[PDB]
Design a binder for this molecule. Sequence first.
Ligand SMILES: [Ca+2]
Ligand SMILES: [Ca+2]
Ligand SMILES: [Mg+2]
Ligand SMILES: [Mg+2]
Ligand SMILES: [Mg+2]
Ligand SMILES: [Mg+2]
Ligand SMILES: [Mg+2]
Ligand SMILES: [Mg+2]
Ligand SMILES: [Mg+2]
Ligand SMILES: [Mg+2]
Ligand SMILES: [Zn+2]
Ligand SMILES: [Zn+2]
Ligand SMILES: [Zn+2]
Ligand SMILES: [Zn+2]
Ligand SMILES: [Zn+2]
Lengths: 270, 270
Amino acid sequence: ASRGCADDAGWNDPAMPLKVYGNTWYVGTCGISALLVTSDAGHILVDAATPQAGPQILANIRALGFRPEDVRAIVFSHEHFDHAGSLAELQKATGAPVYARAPAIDTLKRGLPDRTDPQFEVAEPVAPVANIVTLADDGVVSVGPLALTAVASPGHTPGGTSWTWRSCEGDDCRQMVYADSLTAISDDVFRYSDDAAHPGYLAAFRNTLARVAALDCDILVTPHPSASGLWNRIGPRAAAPLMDTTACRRYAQGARQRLEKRLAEEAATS
Amino acid sequence: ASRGCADDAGWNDPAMPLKVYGNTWYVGTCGISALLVTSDAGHILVDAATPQAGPQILANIRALGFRPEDVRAIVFSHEHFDHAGSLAELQKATGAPVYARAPAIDTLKRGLPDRTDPQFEVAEPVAPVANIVTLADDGVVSVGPLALTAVASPGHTPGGTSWTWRSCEGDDCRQMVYADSLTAISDDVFRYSDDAAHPGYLAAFRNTLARVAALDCDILVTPHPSASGLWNRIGPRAAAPLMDTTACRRYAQGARQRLEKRLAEEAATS
Ligand SMILES: [Ca+2]
Ligand SMILES: [Ca+2]
Ligand SMILES: [Mg+2]
Ligand SMILES: [Mg+2]
Ligand SMILES: [Mg+2]
Ligand SMILES: [Mg+2]
Ligand SMILES: [Mg+2]
Ligand SMILES: [Mg+2]
Ligand SMILES: [Mg+2]
Ligand SMILES: [Mg+2]
Ligand SMILES: [Zn+2]
Ligand SMILES: [Zn+2]
Ligand SMILES: [Zn+2]
Ligand SMILES: [Zn+2]
Ligand SMILES: [Zn+2]
């Protein structure tokens, strides 16, 4: 019997790919999520993990019997190296456009962020993405019968996006939410409380928390699987239900608590 | 043990009131539905059954421990005597406004329909309703934390409306649908196929069927409880699940089949 993934798994530690629900499949690593949403008309790939993960994701797609060339759209959570790292690699393999909200586009073209990213100084360099389609903040990415809805989720980054869609097993259909990271973490310089340095940025983060908390949410998945206890819900160590309609509310509420702790930490330092 | 209601129950045969789900309660008769949606800020009454049913509905509200004076809005399915019959009676008892779409208002003010009703010649006279609030075709009726969304459902009548809302038992929340009648029945004169006599009417009926079929639908209830097999899902004779996410689709599909049978019948007669 396979032993499954640890919550503190390395970002590049391999995971055997497995169904999440219906036509949503997990193709990421033990430490970093990537999802494949499939149809007979082609697929949507969600996230790219770390600049090193291209090959594992591609191997995992094929392990499930899907062809990377049948992926017709790529979307992602946010423009940090640990989720956008293999986008260019995956675009070449699939031929698919990458969809990005406006505040992520320059980062994807450079392969590095700018000072608008809270984690600017700790960024690792990425391959640029060549074919980017600008995604409206409430846009829908459609491939055949598939439709993934964007929920703009700035805060952890300027360009972050949560994604939502329906997956079915026969007539039993579930609202899937791939909620973006909501951690208020930074490099050693950035201060969430310095509004003059980034006007409206923290307010937008608070608004993201409220929007995520309010989503219709049957099955939650997060870019770091442990942030939603994914390995306690699927795979060999699963001991809790996959479906929990309170999950997005609890996720956002915890994130709000942690955001306010970060603000307290900033108040305590000059 | 109580024996429960028959599917061919008389419209005025009494039913003991019982929870449907959460804060949605059944307060109608064995043959004709009425629902009460409750909150600590007041309630919404859905439908009025037959001109004779005022007292049973009011008794049933009180049997559950709710006060008619705490009802703050009344809505209804459609403007036939067997669903709108006791509206004026219930308005007096509750003091609540009745919400109606534009094509039902004159019928509610007269207490009889006009020739726009397929069943005009078989109408029974109703008490007029004095305080009517005009409801937009996609309007929301709000009372405290309650919010009922209108889905205009012309076809069986010009003014018919389906209603949808969420009811919860703790954290387990359900999308309730009180779908209007979809039966293509008439008096001896009306022809659904005579578009010149009522331009666009049948197209609107077909559009209603499509809209109802597409609703998010956890628990379906219908003005005639048997039309959705309600007594096979709640009460003493229940043998099938209350929740069925296919119910609105199946309801509308059956109705489409019956509508097309009606068109065949009309083609066969001059
Ligand atoms: Ca995360
Ligand atoms: Ca009915
Ligand atoms: Mg692998
Ligand atoms: Mg790579
Ligand atoms: Mg930038
Ligand atoms: Mg959580
Ligand atoms: Mg009774
Ligand atoms: Mg009466
Ligand atoms: Mg009229
Ligand atoms: Mg049915
Ligand atoms: Zn990040
Ligand atoms: Zn990350
Ligand atoms: Zn649902
Ligand atoms: Zn009727
Ligand atoms: Zn009726």
